[PDB]
Symmetry: D2
């Protein structure tokens, strides 16, 4: 009678959110701790809907077993789907995701990254954990009255800008669709890229990836920046030409950099590669610089974000069962 | 003919700033990284001025050696650790506080976010090639309540930053300034109200008999489960043994400590190759949700330039026979 | 028609070895990394055989669920943690020890050297770009005395390795084998002699009422200052609270623990995002000269192949109606 | 009257060794905690002899001040002297060092490195320190009955071989001056390089650096090795073509590698570069591989070695004062 959903890779918090928000939905929900892989795909027997996540390995064999079991929808409770062999589904079931949003989580994370690399909080941690309370080399800069250059004045950039204005930073910004009323309200100034590069003590990337923003941060543009600039990217990996970023670090143009995204993150992120070789030379090199901080696309990861993802997942499933268009469908080609 | 100054505990930019701001004064400056203790006090021979730092051990023997060497002024950068009564007017003592309000408020926000979003933990994973984010979920600050204990200048800067996050802010101080509360958009409350309602609590108040161990088993009982606590004020504001129990009980969600009630035995030094004798500190260092840093909230280029200048002004005032603004009085 | 086996706690080479050595038997194998607890016990539905590991929590509820699902055999890899009396003959239980003597002796020498020469500490420095070696001085093993407690097969292998270093070796066992002592070149001694004379002490003996807390405040008092202690035997051989005091007093120079008296709450799991409730363990983890590893002395490719084979032989014997050599008897 | 010696960078243990062993020498010894640099060089006033160490910065200005102060000998209590501006001394004083020996410390260290990388002891440490008691990915191999290939059968190689024979490894070895009696006594077999490469599960470099051993471990020779080989070098940095070592790691030819020496260690070793950029790409890349362990020329560092260095330093100084040839002189060109 009720729609039967099997969930994989569930943590206590996921379970509580699905039971809490799903109370209104008329689904019958079973929560498993294991990931969805070919070892576990036969547990989908008897279910109508499978809910998956970023650690699953949803390959051909997994897909085949779920289709044979008559699964009709695979709902990913995340924005990525690189772990799904889309080409093998063949419309045997639909696939849906949850697009990234959570703009406060991400703007807040960005400021946490700026401060962590500016003030060396990660490095201090590793020292004190080992009983080393020396602070030599950990000096940073005050943000007060420095200039933040914000690339992108969407919803994430606006939240970011309002926080940095709270630090009494001076804020300049670049966007192809500037909004002068928001600039008046938050107290920042729109400028060209050239002006932003020349004048900014810290630079954050908060703009979408298009042909024109692809590798916008590269050798040429970093030459225009101030020596010692702090760069942060929680937007998209491909906004930065990573190889050039390595040279600018070496030349000392870039004072520090924090990356929550990476141009070839698909091969690395969300996975523990701590016991295997990292084949990407540029990533392996970035990980050895004292002033590089990398994190694995975690800017979103707050309980509020997770709760909204949970809601979107339940709405995804309801829309499917009611035959509505799937706005979060992942197309199979 | 030149005034001779020997510096101990030299770190980032100390040498360049002292040289730059000390020019045109006829100073001759010797810059050591080592600390001042009885084992290095002999190096003060032939100097007019010794300039030290908070972790020096300036005990009676150290004092006697410098007095014997005829030093005239001992100037302590960033200190609160001199055995002042053994000096006995043999030389003057100066103490230059590391009061740098922007640096410290900004650091506090960096600590809140680091422990909330587990940035330090992520770093240790990704450096080792582990890109899993399991267990690293935090909370949004937006629309949460921040409880700020102390509304001096560091607290005000902090509050204006957190109001930028659109946190709701309440605060406690014995000398409230309602004009600033109206300007920054916060509300003054009692300690009991602050404990009950705050999702984040920051300590930015002076250490008195009454604030000593104000955060303790009873007060932490009144806090919300999962509260984030940060302390960049003074170590003694927190009963550290009770803090260990409140972590175990899971009352405290996460804690960042830039100060520690017995930091004088540990801070600013590398003890990575010796035993830490303090049980409580050794225990705090093994919690997943404790971040300790070594009193480094002050540590920016701008702060250090201002401290350096204040230090040199005291030295110049001494040499020109004016009052030493930062002199520690004896008698 | 196929025998169905579900594996929990799968790690390095488990899947490949079970597949390789299990071929030609008509087994159908499902391989999970998760652990077996009441929250995963339902996954055993439809299986004939469950194959678990030492950190599973096989409590009454877990047992009841597997019995309800009709499992016939629970085979525990590397265990000592099943609530055996709740089983009540509803299924058979097997326990396959992680006894692998070369792996374990070799690991022990790697632990001695790691803590002596501070290799682990160096790693954390150089990974961060710190190539200073200050504080990392060790001692030569050549001509020092090694005290080996237990001369079973793991102890014998260890002793032959340390004799290769030209260490002098003394040993304690209640069942001494003088022929092996003549062959390997060591001398049997009392515990008091071993404590007094040993620069290195390794525990490689079984846990009985008499060896329980044999290393404690009194016995460590008899040891030489700066002694290196290693334990890859059993956690309970050491009174861990006394070990904390002996570290603080500086009696113990360095200690490597592959086992811990309460390891059953911690080992084999990632607790990096939760509180460690055990005070003593949290304190041991903050000493510079403590190295703890999670019962991994066994963990080589060869050991695991042999354990895998023994596991599969028990399963095959079950299916063919022969005695299960590693069955844990009930009644 | 007595010869006056000023010592820099003294640790408690150094002091105790100099007082203990110098009791027979008739020197007057002053021990300072500070390093010798231009900030401290005027403390050499009134002394006849300066005793220095690897963290000193003995540059032109330092040299000039010591010469003006009438220093006659600079004794380095270490084997290196890259931190001395030799060209500026101009025979104003002599410079002596202590050549490396301590063969037990170094053979013992080598085995500690082999085991650390084989058994992942360093990685386990970082995990348990963080409260992670998982052992996934930490599996090693038994040494028993595997084959160790030892390049160099000098005093260090012989000690190493006797230890590994204690593990009941099979040992084969290469040396240009083989000693068949030592091979009979220790139970190993001499072989060609080609045979050693083809047959060894672990390989240790314990041979001197000459034209023929320079980059002997390179692309071509590592192609001949077994996949998964464990390589250890406590001999000299230049025995390995480091760039090729990075490619062999990536290809998975090398299973793990432990380096106590590095071909351009002069720029890095003994110094804390944890708050600055590492300009050497190859070093920065090596530091990010899971199966690379680097340590800073510490194989020697035991109390026995330090005590012998102390003795050699005192003998250095006595030989100088008595006008004997200085066998440990560092020539100034």
């Amino acid at each position: 009678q009720k729609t039967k959903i099997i969930f994989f890779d569930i943590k206590d918090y996921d379970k509580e959110f699905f039971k809490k928000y799903g109370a209104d939905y008329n689904f019958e929900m079973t929560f498993l701790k294991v990931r969805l892989t070919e070892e576990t795909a036969n547990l989908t027997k008897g279910y109508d809907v499978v809910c998956g996540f970023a650690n699953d390995n949803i390959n051909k064999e997994t897909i085949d077993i779920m289709a044979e079991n008559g699964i009709k929808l695979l709902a990913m409770r995340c924005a990525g789907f690189n772990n799904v062999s889309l080409k093998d589904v063949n419309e045997r079931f639909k696939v849906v995701r949850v697009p990234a949003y959570s703009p406060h989580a991400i703007a807040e994370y960005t400021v946490g990254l700026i401060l962590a690399v500016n003030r060396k909080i990660n490095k201090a941690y590793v020292r004190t954990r080992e009983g080393n309370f020396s602070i030599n080399g950990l000096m940073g800069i005050d943000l007060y009255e420095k200039t933040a250059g914000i690339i992108g004045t969407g919803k994430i950039g606006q939240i970011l800008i309002k926080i940095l204005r709270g630090f009494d930073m001076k804020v300049i910004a670049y966007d192809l669709f500037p909004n002068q009323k928001v600039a008046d309200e938050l107290g920042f100034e729109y400028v060209s890229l050239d002006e932003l590069y020349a004048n900014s003590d810290i630079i954050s990337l908060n703009c979408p990836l298009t042909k024109d923003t692809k590798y916008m941060i590269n050798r040429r543009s970093m030459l225009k920046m101030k020596d010692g600039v702090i760069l942060v990217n929680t937007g998209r990996g491909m906004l930065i030409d990573s190889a050039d970023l390595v040279e600018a670090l070496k030349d000392k143009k870039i004072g520090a950099v924090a990356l929550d995204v990476y141009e070839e993150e698909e091969n690395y992120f969300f996975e523990d590669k701590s016991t295997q070789v990292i084949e990407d030379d540029i990533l392996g090199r970035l990980l050895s610089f004292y002033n590089v901080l990398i994190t694995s696309h975690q800017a979103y990861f707050t309980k509020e974000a997770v709760g909204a993802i949970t809601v979107t997942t339940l709405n995804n499933i309801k829309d499917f069962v009611e035959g509505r268009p799937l706005v979060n469908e992942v197309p199979q080609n």
